[PDB]
């Protein structure tokens, strides 16, 4: 630390390094490419092994959690019992025909619900069962209307302040 240099915080004061003395804590990726093939061989080794069957089972369209991501629409982890019911599928039958199930999910909103019942209902059309014997909103463009009058900020800020000082306006 002589000079303008930023204060360094290089956390390497543990014996991560491998020397005569230590078996180090190191994770190199030298086998990264080999693994990429291994998986690649193995997924291909698997799809060949189960030819008719889709490489990956049907999954729900779920909402992402926080405000940072609730706009995002990731693939989920198996359908709700209520979704499988509404699609008319049997929930313990569903996995056997390649539909993932998830007992834990709740359909908190009719939106994600109905996006999925359509999804299973769409999947069951495409499905061919050998006998034993992501949608989202978009907008175009429009003339501004009543929007030109109202300031959305004092609208935004009332509604924010309404919550923000809601506890402090009770005591008053």
């Amino acid at each position: 630390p002589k000079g303008k240099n930023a204060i360094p915080h290089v956390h390497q004061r543990k014996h991560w390094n491998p020397c005569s003395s230590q078996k180090g804590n190191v994770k190199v990726f030298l086998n990264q490419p080999a693994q990429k093939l291994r998986r690649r061989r193995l997924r291909l080794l698997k799809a060949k092994k189960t030819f008719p069957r889709p490489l990956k089972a049907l999954r729900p369209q779920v909402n992402c959690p926080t405000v940072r991501h609730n706009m995002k629409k990731r693939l989920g982890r198996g359908f709700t019992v209520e979704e499988l019911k509404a699609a008319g599928i049997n929930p313990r039958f569903a996995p056997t025909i390649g539909i993932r199930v998830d007992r834990r999910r709740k359909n908190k909103s009719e939106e994600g619900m109905s996006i999925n019942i359509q999804r299973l209902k769409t999947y069951m059309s495409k499905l061919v069962l050998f006998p034993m014997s992501t949608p989202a909103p978009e907008a175009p463009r429009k003339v501004t209307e009543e929007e030109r009058t109202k300031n959305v900020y004092k609208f935004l800020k009332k509604n924010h302040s309404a919550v923000r000082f809601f506890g402090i306006r009770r005591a008053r």
Binding site: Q12, K14, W16, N25, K27, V28, F29, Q32
Partner: protein, 203 residues
């Protein structure tokens, strides 16, 4: 619902009747070996929760354990190096007493495979946990779908590896989520995972 009666009768350990029964036992158990096999559990309803079944190849053992904290076995009680690492009497074993009783038993009798243990009694000096060892090579065990996992070699000494419910307790695994992230595959696994110096191949 006989279990429901026998389970809440034992929830009143402090009741003077249950306090009397327990009294006579702890007396009775003091005059017995540190390990004692039972033809039956003292707590049939509790042993059965933990997977005991009155079947061939299930056997129960009452393993005694001295209570109180560990005294760290340094010579003459002296400790070397830093003052923090001093302290003989007050540092405690970082291991459960159901664990230590499951481990005493499973080490004495490698013939068997402990399934669980439960608290049985505890006088001033001792605690008694009755372990439910399974015998891996009893045919009844080998052939029962509910239990024959224990036969698989992966569980040879589950208890010594802290896999039993007691050994998961002190191992912190009674907590999912943010209360056991530093702990979670294992404290060791958590350590590798955080202390590794990953070198991405192209960085």
């Amino acid at each position: 619902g006989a279990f429901m009666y026998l389970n809440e009768l034992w929830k009143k350990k402090s009741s003077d009747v249950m306090r009397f029964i327990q009294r006579v036992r702890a007396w009775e158990f003091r005059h017995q070996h540190t390990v004692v096999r039972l033809r039956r559990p003292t707590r049939p309803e509790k042993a059965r929760m933990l997977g005991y079944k009155t079947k061939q190849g299930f056997s129960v053992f009452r393993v005694r354990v001295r209570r109180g904290g560990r005294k760290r076995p340094v010579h003459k009680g002296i400790t070397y190096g830093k003052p923090k690492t001093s302290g003989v009497l007050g540092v405690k074993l970082n291991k459960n007493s159901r664990a230590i009783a499951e481990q005493r038993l499973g080490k004495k009798y490698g013939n068997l495979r402990v399934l669980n243990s439960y608290w049985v009694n505890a006088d001033s000096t001792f605690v008694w946990y009755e372990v439910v060892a399974v015998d891996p090579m009893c045919r009844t065990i080998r052939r029962d779908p509910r239990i024959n996992w224990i036969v698989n070699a992966v569980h040879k000494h589950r208890e010594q590896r802290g896999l039993t419910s007691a050994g998961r307790k002190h191992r912190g695994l009674r907590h999912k989520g943010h209360k056991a992230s530093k702990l979670r595959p294992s404290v060791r696994a958590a350590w590798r995972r955080n202390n590794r110096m990953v070198f991405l191949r192209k960085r």
